[PDB]
Amino acid sequence: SNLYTERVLSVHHWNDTLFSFKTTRNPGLRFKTGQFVMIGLEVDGRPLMRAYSIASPNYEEHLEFFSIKVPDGPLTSRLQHLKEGDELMVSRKPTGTLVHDDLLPGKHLYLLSTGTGMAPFLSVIQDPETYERYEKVILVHGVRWVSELAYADFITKVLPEHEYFGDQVKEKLIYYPLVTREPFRNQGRQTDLMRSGKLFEDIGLPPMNPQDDRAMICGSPSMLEETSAVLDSFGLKISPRMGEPGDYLIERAFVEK
Ligand SMILES: Cc1cc2nc3c(=O)[nH]c(=O)nc-3n(C[C@H](O)[C@H](O)[C@H](O)COP(=O)(O)OP(=O)(O)OC[C@H]3O[C@@H](n4cnc5c(N)ncnc54)[C@H](O)[C@@H]3O)c2cc1C
Ligand SMILES: NC(=O)c1ccc[n+]([C@@H]2O[C@H](COP(=O)([O-])OP(=O)(O)OC[C@H]3O[C@@H](n4cnc5c(N)ncnc54)[C@H](OP(=O)(O)O)[C@@H]3O)[C@@H](O)[C@H]2O)c1
């Protein structure tokens, strides 16, 4: 099989349905920030592979994945049990549309996500190129429960202290977690908050316009479609195809199987 077999380095469970893990990374595995790759486990004679956004920075020699834990999900029912040292199959060629090159120059980069959709954005917010290209980077992470706001500490406390671009992070990264079913400082769906302009008021930024604002949307199919429409409502135009820069990019965080 032409798959990499990486080794789990660490695992961290965020809550009952979310966990992340880091694995070794084959030097041959190159990827652009935002991309996903197939990862999985050998099950009953065949790799059980699923598309996974690489949540780690593309210049670090390890991979990190932010994962859902579906009770009876073929892969995650097993993946949730990953432990240090475990093998993880990883495909050789990443892919995906959430890449910097396909966003026209702009001033603000909105990373609109829900659930595990924040995964590729974890890579984005750790990518120096993100800060080279934007004045502001807004990571919106919409979840149902506060416990699902995975990486909170990393985003708000660790990343800003990053030895090399923590200053860029402090100056440019706005983290806007959103919770919809539990008391939280920022309540609601980002679609609604953007339509009302509340999201931008909350983060101290002007409403979006096609000239200044770019976005990457990664979330549930439903959110993806509606958020895309919201951005369209502001006059932004999605990149029509890879290699063809646009105002925003989208990728489903998952698909209903
Ligand atoms: C481009 C792309 C990138 C992806 N990146 C990630 C990632 O970084 N992390 C991750 O956990 N998953 C990601 N997914 C989903 C992932 O590929 C699998 O669906 C996941 O790993 C669950 O596999 P499964 O075999 O356990 O359950 P599956 O049979 O895949 O899915 C079972 C059911 O789980 C729900 N489901 C699956 N994945 C999710 C999810 N992430 N969040 C909420 N509900 C979900 C749906 O209701 C689905 O029908 C991605 C999917 C695509 C298409
Ligand atoms: N197929 C879909 O499009 C879809 C979408 C959402 C959930 N689900 C189901 O519920 C499970 C958990 O899905 P999830 O991972 O994304 O967790 P989720 O909790 O269901 O969604 C996380 C966040 O996304 C928000 N959201 C949902 N729909 C939205 C929309 N159209 N626009 C903007 N924000 C939206 C939710 O608000 P609310 O609390 O108001 O829902 C919540 O804050 C999935 O495994 C799936 O079975 C499916």
From Swiss-Prot:
PROSITE patterns: FAD_FR. The keyword Oxidoreductase applies. One of its GO terms (molecular function) is ferredoxin-NADP+ reductase activity. Induction: Increased transcription under iron starvation. Its EC number is 1.18.1.2. FAD binds at residues 50-53, 66, 68, 75-76, 116, 254, 256-257. Its cofactor is FAD. One of its GO terms (biological process) is cellular response to oxidative stress. SUPFAM superfamilies: Ferredoxin reductase-like, C-terminal NADP-linked domain, Riboflavin synthase domain-like. CDD domains: FNR1. FAD and NADP(+) substrate form hydrogen bonds. It catalyses: 2 reduced [2Fe-2S]-[ferredoxin] + NADP(+) + H(+) = 2 oxidized [2Fe-2S]-[ferredoxin] + NADPH. PANTHER family: FLAVODOXIN_FERREDOXIN--NADP REDUCTASE, OXIDOREDUCTASE FAD/NAD(P)-BINDING DOMAIN PROTEIN. Monomer. Belongs to the ferredoxin--NADP reductase type 1 family. NADP(+) binds at residues 143-144, 180-181, 189, 222, 226, 254, 256. Residues 1-101 form the FAD-binding FR-type domain. Transports electrons between ferredoxin and NADPH. Provides electrons to heme oxygenase (pigA) allowing anaerobic heme degradation. Provides electrons necessary to reduce and mobilize Fe(3+) in a heterooligomeric bacterioferritin (BFR) complex to Fe(2+). Reduction of Fe(3+) in a pure FtnA BFR does not require Bfd. Reduction of Fe(3+) in a pure BfrB BFR does require Bfd. This is Ferredoxin--NADP reductase. It comes from Pseudomonas aeruginosa (strain ATCC 15692 / DSM 22644 / CIP 104116 / JCM 14847 / LMG 12228 / 1C / PRS 101 / PAO1). Keywords: FAD, Flavoprotein, NADP, Nucleotide-binding, Oxidoreductase. The keyword Transmembrane helix does not apply.
